[PDB]
Amino acid sequence: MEIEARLEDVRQRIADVAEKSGRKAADVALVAVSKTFDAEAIQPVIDAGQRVFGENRVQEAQGKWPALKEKTSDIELHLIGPLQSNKAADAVALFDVVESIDREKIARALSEECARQGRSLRFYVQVNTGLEPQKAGIDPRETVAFVAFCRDELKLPVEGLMCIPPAEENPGPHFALLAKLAGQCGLEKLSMGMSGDFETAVEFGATSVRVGSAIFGSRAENLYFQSH
Ligand SMILES: [Pr+3]
């Protein structure tokens, strides 16, 4: 019963900040990040009512989600980690949403595979909001132009923008910049806010937050839970 309690608390926390910010809890999607957790640990979350999940790696996802999806028909799986061009095919075959379009090469790859597989997924363009040399993502200054490229030239539908700000600084400006860019791109969806800042993210307009440990517990905790 720990999972149900944790999930309800997360949803309640989302609702509290949403309402405080003048928004509806319904406006914020909760993506349960299941990275590092096996199918056995994930099922309890699905049983608790969760349908939207996120995985950082295609390979890890391939090993556990197929069985989970044939068991539960309405799963919405998001790829929230970097994608190598040689895994694009596998990703298009398994995921419903790919939030990591961080460069031209992968946008093209995703575009061709959707075509080759007769599929139409949902996509987010990842922005390197702080322009950190060590981080992936489109330059904020080239984002508007990049989204036009995806939508017009690659005929790749783009749902919104996504970011993962540097952990050692205030998320505020990063979220605010992403919101601004989204408006300039004519996009209404924003994937920002993770484990330690999803509440602040909602305050800046986040429409989708990625929460992992708060739902599953840490690796140690979760396994402790699944003893009885
Ligand atoms: Pr309850």
Side-chain angles (χ1 to χ4, degrees), residues 149-164:
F149 163 72
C150 289
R151 290 170 76 62
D152 304 321
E153 183 157 348
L154 303 185
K155 299 298 181 181
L156 187 78
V158 179
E159 180 165 306
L161 303 184
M162 177 276 259
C163 79
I164 299 174

Side-chain angles (χ1 to χ4, degrees), residues 30-37 42 50 52-56 64-65 80 193-195 209-213 215-216:
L30 166 59
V31 177
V33 181
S34 44
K35 175 177 55 66
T36 81
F37 295 110
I42 294 171
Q50 191 60 20
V52 181
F53 293 83
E55 287 293 337
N56 280 255
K64 58 182 167 176
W65 280 102
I80 65 178
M194 294 181 283
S195 69
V209 300
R210 284 158 285 168
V211 180
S213 312
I215 295 169
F216 289 94

Side-chain angles (χ1 to χ4, degrees), residues 43-64:
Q43 191 57 51
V45 184
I46 293 173
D47 291 331
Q50 191 60 20
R51 291 291 184 284
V52 181
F53 293 83
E55 287 293 337
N56 280 255
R57 300 185 291 92
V58 172
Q59 300 94 322
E60 184 183 337
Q62 289 176 291
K64 58 182 167 176

